Amino acid sequence: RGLFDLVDDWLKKDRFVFVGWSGLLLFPTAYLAAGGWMTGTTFVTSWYTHGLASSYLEGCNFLTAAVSTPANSVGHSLLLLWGPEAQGDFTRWCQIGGLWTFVALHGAFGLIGFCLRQFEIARLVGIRPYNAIAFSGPIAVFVSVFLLYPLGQASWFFAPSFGVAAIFRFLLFLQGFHNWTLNPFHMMGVAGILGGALLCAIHGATVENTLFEDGDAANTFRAFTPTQSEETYSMVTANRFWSQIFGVAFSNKRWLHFFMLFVPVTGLWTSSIGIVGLALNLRAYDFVSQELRAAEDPEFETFYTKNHLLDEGIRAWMAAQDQPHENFVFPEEVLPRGNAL
Amino acid sequence: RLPEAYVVFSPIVDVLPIIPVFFLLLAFVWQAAIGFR
Amino acid sequence: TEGTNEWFGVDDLRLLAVLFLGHWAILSLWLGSYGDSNEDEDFFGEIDYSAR
Amino acid sequence: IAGRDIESTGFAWWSGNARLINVSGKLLGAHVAHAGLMVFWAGAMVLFEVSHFVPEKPTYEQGFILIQHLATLGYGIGPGGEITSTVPYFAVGVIHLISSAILGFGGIYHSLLGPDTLEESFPFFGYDWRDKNKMTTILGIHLCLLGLGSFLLVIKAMYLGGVYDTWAPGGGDVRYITTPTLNPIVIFGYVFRSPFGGDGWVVSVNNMEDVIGGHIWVGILCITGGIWHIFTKPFAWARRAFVWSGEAYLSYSLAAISLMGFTAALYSWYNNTAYPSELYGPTGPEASQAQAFTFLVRDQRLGANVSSAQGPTGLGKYLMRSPSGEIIFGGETMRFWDLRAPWVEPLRGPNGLDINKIKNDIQPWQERRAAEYMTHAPLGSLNSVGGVATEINSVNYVSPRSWLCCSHFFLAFFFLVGHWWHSGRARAAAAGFEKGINRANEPVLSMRPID
Amino acid sequence: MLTLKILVYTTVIFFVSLFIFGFLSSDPSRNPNRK
Amino acid sequence: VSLWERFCAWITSTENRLYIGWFGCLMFPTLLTATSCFIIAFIAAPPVDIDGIREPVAGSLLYGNNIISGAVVPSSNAIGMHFYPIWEAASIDEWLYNGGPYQLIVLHFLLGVSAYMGREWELSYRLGMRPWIFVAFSAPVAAASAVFLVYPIGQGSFSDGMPLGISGTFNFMLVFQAEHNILMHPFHMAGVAGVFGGSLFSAMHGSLVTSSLIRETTENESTNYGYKFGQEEETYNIVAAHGYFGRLIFQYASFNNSRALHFFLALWPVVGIWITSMGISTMAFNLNGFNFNQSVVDSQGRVINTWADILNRANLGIEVMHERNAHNFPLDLA
Amino acid sequence: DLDEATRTVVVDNAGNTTVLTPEQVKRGKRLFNATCGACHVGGITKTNPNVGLDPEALSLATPRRDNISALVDYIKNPTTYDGLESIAEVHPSIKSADIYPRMRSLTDEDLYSIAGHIMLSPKIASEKWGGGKIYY
Ligand code: CLA
Ligand code: CLA
Ligand code: CLA
Ligand SMILES: CCCCCCCCCCCCCCCC(=O)OC[C@H](COP(=O)(O)OC[C@@H](O)CO)OC(=O)CCCCCCCCCCCCCCC
Ligand SMILES: CC1=C(/C=C/C(C)=C/C=C/C(C)=C/C=C/C=C(C)/C=C/C=C(C)/C=C/C2=C(C)CCCC2(C)C)C(C)(C)CCC1
Ligand SMILES: CC1=C(/C=C/C(C)=C/C=C/C(C)=C/C=C/C=C(C)/C=C/C=C(C)/C=C/C2=C(C)CCCC2(C)C)C(C)(C)CCC1
Ligand code: OEX
Ligand SMILES: [Fe+2]
């Protein structure tokens, strides 16, 4: 009837890719985060920001290419193309590291626009919105690492660059400087990721091994029409199996599939709380009862004090080349070496 | 390298160990042309 | 003496009488049912359901 | 088309060679075609390994794996691991290449024109999987060949040329095995050792007299057991324990071939007798001892008493004492104190490294050997740059031991998975429930209350 | 220490022999299909 | 009638509370001895010379530790790969000093887990199930045998084996990074994709079932009580969740087949952990990951740094500091 | 950016400087990594770390070894660091090239380019050459 109704009926039309209202936020912003990454890893260097090479023009393969974080002198500037740093020039915008905030900002509005996509399709199909709530897990890892972690730090420079090996140094930068593995929020996150991979490997292998005979063929994939009301695997058998192997087992398909939602997602929320606590440098660095004892008793050694000496090697050896803006000129005689290494 | 009566065929020999991989791909090409039936 | 090249780790002679009386004490249990059966009765199955 | 779609058989295209279980001509043509590929690779790889051979670099720096098996047989090898000729390596790679064109033609004949079942026309070759007299005959015929193939090593090491002994007195050279060891307390001494450190179950054969004397007993067993399974029939206990079907025999092999898969992958890491360090490069244990021996020579020239040289931990910096009492090298190399190598065994005694022989008799070929085996340690990378994991990109070396111990070991786990898949199906195909649970008769419902 | 050692080889080849003579005890026939 | 047949009937009975089976004949004695020694060695066990340099590393709770730092320490560098049982130790005090209980726990663990795996087969045979849950459990058995068995073999000592603890795990992972460069190795890459993908398809499948549940309850009681146990009606509209994901990405990327869907949940992690556990195995024999250090040069020939060179300087920090007293010679061959 | 001023290296004990043609610097790298680089990788010596390929360490040898003519002198006749006795029996050389199979096929221009690589590499990388793992 009205003008709003014609636009509402056009976006929600059955077509190849469902656009909806949320596609106006997703499809422009996701296309430019992805294309900003493919351009930045192919053409744009890191020679002026980090003093590296992170492009395909500079000989890096898929692994050692990245879209890199800007300089520490930029601080937390948004680095707009028209801004006071770039001033409209495209070429000087790329050399400062403007594509990285271009990827991260238009990417953050892609994950907004993709989670709104999951509320919109669920309302048209008419289902409960648990996909949009389980996808809030990965939103809490993007925001609290690519956005909330460099905000608490000195600049955008201490953020993960969007490249394969550039994530890998961020894994190593976070052990030596922060002791991230000791943090109980990672420990509750590893329990959800390795726990979530566990549940789909079991529920994959128990459904597929309690199937009913619905055909004479040896292939069991053929014997399932999608609109049938009979269940395709014996729940009573699978309960009787695991009650004797493992001792305790699900007797509820509604509780089972909810539990496959809770375990992976909670590991992304609990691990997201800790990385917000490392923006503020509130790290779980030391057990002081272990540290006061190892200072007074020069014979008491645990595995825990062995990890601190591994972190002095990370804090001293890479920090010269890690942070060229700070100009660490270490002598050879201050770098902690071991015996004969 | 190869003996002097065989130095001519030094490019062809370099391809030869790859050829057993090409039999693995020959099965799928044959399954595509048969229509996977 | 760890890195000696001795059979099944049998260092002393006394450990043999442990091994022989372990396999045989259950072998004799096993022969109480599956022993003393007909060793000449066949089948054209994949699997035999003969007796206890 | 009948027999070659899912409507006739019940197997999809991806599990398509499972249609060959209950046809015998198509199955025979498949096993002789894959045998045509095993041959064809080995002929074509050696020709590839000959055309890239350079006499300047050593045999292991050039990254070959197949022309070093023939040098252990003794073709074209000189004294000290120096490959001389490389005309006989050309000859072997052609016989294993021409012959695959014949085995290739059997795979294309027997599987495209041969009868589907041999049991109709050819009653000698035709069979059934459920038959137990025929299957032990097929096992028996193909065991007497593995007996005869073991004597070809023994004939070649005693009569036809000899084999390469790296322990040969005067240097490693092609040596006729005159007097092999035929003692079953010694030969089966290996088979019943511990697999752990120091004993090292079957890897630790340390001279060619036990190797060639051992392959005699293999030929004795595989012929008597070949004749045993031709004449006889499986006993009462053997008929009750197995599943006599087609896939069950395949999952019996896949368990045993994984045993051979791990063991050949552990020969290549530790053994320096069947795999000479002159050919395959130094072992993992050997390059750890060659470092400590090199700096032993280095600081002995500075007038330092190396026996009384107190280490930084309080142990021996150079010479310390093993937990069994022997004089060994010190460092992280104290774990590899069982390293028995032809360039360090001149310095042994009853006690271990003789201190009098270290102070006086170090020969410069041992210094040229320990410096060669330090710089070519088996530590590499997948892009084939050597050194430690933090080495810069200048050298191009990964040891051929690290390719064999990481690829046959790689396969030997997946063939253990093949024992798990193919025997889970074959035990359940014998029982009837491999297609799923019957809806009319579920076995769990006719049981006790659950508790 | 050679008295403990005797006790272990009893316990190992007790249970190993229950394993070996378990599957020799007509073990494929113990299925819910028949017998 | 016989005593053995009345014992085989009990040990293979599915009417027991826990199925014992013939693998339980060597699962239960193995894992109860790995357990009962672990609880004692974690709580009350004296310090252990791990580096072989007679510097004993404390690992138990009574010697001033906690849950995080306490760990069953691996055996000595002095022993190395040698089999070290109690009777080959001349006292228990000499056994506990040199890293005794690490070999007693690990060897009774790997036998009991490889028997727990075969026990999952056996009950599937006696219940009429298709058999292959135990093939999915091969993937953590591959990974447990990689860090406790295969990596001490190729490195030649149980002292390089993984410490049974929590802080000992991260001593294991970091030292494995400096010496082998696991992150650049494509098999750790193929299993990070296995568990990120595994936790994706877990929470993606578990949401689309819970989204499309059928009304069987009221708003006061729980959602889960609309499933009665052992019912034969399907508890969710699978056509509904297919039409949702058929619009969320596109139409042809959606499994309408629930059997092929529930197979892909078992494929992706298990293949990802088979491949990963053969990354530790091929890096046990010093076939390390990629090494792109000093790979990008200018025309003058000066080394231009990359991200791998920054990653290298993190590896050089751990390499020069791990086992800071055990080394005497310039190259960590072990 | 391989300028001829950067390719110009010192050639004799007096101090004359000649330039290296661009095939000398290319064969000089391939031959050095194939022959010498097993132990002398990046200027350090694996089997004797005191005696490196540093331009400081080559200069302090009792015959001065910085020159191209002095390095090819060392290859055909390797004395020690103090130059009193010969270690041709243990270092690979031309004089003792029956034991080392790696040096049976080397011409004069091939050693001229290998010694060119040892001399021109501290001019490219000032501190990485023979600086150990600190300067990787
Ligand atoms: C080791 C590799 C190998 C081998 C030897 C075989 C062999 C066979 N497969 Mg097979 N297969 C394989 C891998 C292999 N497969 C793989 C990896 C897959 C998964 C994609 C399949 C899937 C598959 C299916 C789905 C089916 C088979 C079938 C067959 C059999 C008959 C084929 C036939 O009659 O069709 C005719 C074949 C052709 C027309 C192919 C022509 C290609 C020619 C032979 C190539 C020759 C090239 C060579 C260089 C020439 C040398 C000549 C010589 C003179 C030098 C045959 C025994 C069929 C079967 O079960 O039979 C009952 C069947 O249904 N296969
Ligand atoms: C293990 C492999 C194997 C097996 C079991 C068979 C089995 C069979 N083939 Mg076949 N074949 C094979 C390989 C094999 N073939 C190969 C490799 C080729 C290519 C050359 C052929 C080519 C071929 C043709 C062209 C024909 C057969 C035929 C037959 C059938 C009758 C053969 C006959 O008359 O027996 C009696 C035959 C003999 C006694 C002659 C034996 C002579 C050989 C050279 C002795 C072998 C020497 C030695 C054992 C091998 C050592 C090498 C080894 C280490 C690899 C029979 C089922 C025929 C058939 O089915 O009829 C339609 C037929 O026409 N085959
Ligand atoms: C490729 C190798 C191969 C394969 C697959 C087979 C396959 C088979 N053999 Mg065979 N065999 C082979 C080589 C092979 N054989 C060789 C080379 C020999 C000569 C030594 C034998 C000697 C042989 C005999 C004597 C018997 C078999 C039997 C069997 C059947 C399975 C039994 C089994 O595996 O128990 C595995 C069992 C063990 C590894 C341990 C068994 C321990 C025995 C039973 C203790 C009793 C002492 C006994 C007299 C042997 C003394 C040695 C020592 C243990 C004291 C099966 C058909 C049995 C059969 O049914 O005969 C037809 C049988 O009785 N085989
Ligand atoms: C030798 C081998 C013998 C088997 C060994 C036995 C060990 C089994 C462990 C028991 C799990 C008990 C947890 C109760 C849990 C409980 O009772 O749940 C009971 C629940 C049954 O749910 P139903 O379907 O009955 O629920 C329907 C509705 O009523 C939902 O409320 O079963 C499961 O969902 C458990 C599956 C995950 C199992 C979680 C196990 C996590 C591992 C344990 C983590 C703790 C280890 C800490 C050590 C420091
Ligand atoms: C930045 C920027 C921009 C732009 C944007 C865009 C427009 C972009 C796009 C772009 C794009 C969008 C890109 C793409 C790329 C792609 C690529 C380059 C791909 C590649 C691929 C590959 C290489 C792969 C491979 C493979 C294959 C082929 C098959 C098999 C498998 C594999 C995976 C291996 C603008 C203007 C706004 C401005 C601002 C800034
Ligand atoms: C050449 C040589 C040699 C020799 C060799 C020998 C002489 C060998 C032997 C071998 C042998 C002598 C082996 C054995 C093996 C055995 C086995 C491995 C067994 C197995 C078994 C089984 C598998 C069983 C199973 C079962 C059970 C347990 C229960 C029931 C069921 C059944 C029956 C299935 C030497 C050392 C001098 C050195 C080097 C060279
Ligand atoms: O023990 Mn445990 O960590 Ca395998 O690397 Mn060599 O050893 Mn000792 O150092 Mn580094
Ligand atoms: Fe499900």
Structural summary, described in words:
- This is part of a larger assembly, with 7 protein chains of 7 kinds.
- By secondary structure, chain A is mostly helical.
- Chain A has 13 helices and 2 strands.
- Chain A has helices spanning 3-11, 23-42, 90-96, 98-125, 130-134, 136-152, 164-176, 184-207, 235-245, 253-276, 288-296, 304-317, 319-322; strands at 66-67, 162-163.
- Chain A is flat.
- Chain C is mainly alpha-helical and 52 residues long.
- Chain G has 136 residues and is mostly helical.
- Chain G has 4 helices and 2 strands.
- Chain G has helices at 24-36, 55-59, 68-76, 108-124; strands spanning 8-10, 17-19.
- At the A-F interface, helix 4, helix 5, helix 7, helix 8 and helix 9 of A face strand 2, helix 4, helix 5, helix 7 and helix 8 of F.
What topology does this entry show?
This is part of a larger assembly, with seven protein chains of seven kinds.
Chain A lengths: L2 H9 L11 H20 L23 E2 L22 H7 L1 H28 L4 H5 L1 H17 L9 E2 H13 L7 H24 L27 H11 L7 H24 L11 H9 L7 H14 L1 H4 L19
Chain E lengths: L3 H20 L12
Chain G lengths: L7 E3 L6 E3 L4 H13 L18 H5 L8 H9 L31 H17 L12
Helix pairs in contact in G: 1-4, 3-4
Fe (ii) ion binds next to helix 8 of chain F.
Cofactor (chain G): heme c
GO biological process, one term (chain G): photosynthesis, light reaction
Membrane topology (chain G): Peripheral membrane protein
**How much beta of chain B, percentage-wise?**
under 5%
Secondary structure class of chain F reads mainly alpha
3D shape of chain F: globular
Strand arrangement in the largest pleated sheet of chain F: 1-2
- Give the strand tally of chain B: 0
Number of strands of chain F: 6
Order of helices and strands of chain B: HH
How many whole angstroms does the radius of gyration of chain B measure? Answer: 16 Å
Strand content of chain F: under 5%
Largest sheet of chain B: none
Class by SSE composition of chain B:
mainly alpha
Number of helices of chain B: 2
| Assembly context of the chains | part of a larger assembly
PDB class: electron transport
Keywords: Photosystem, electron transport
Entry title: Structure of C2S2-type PSII-FCPII supercomplex from diatom
Chain A: Photosystem II reaction center protein D2
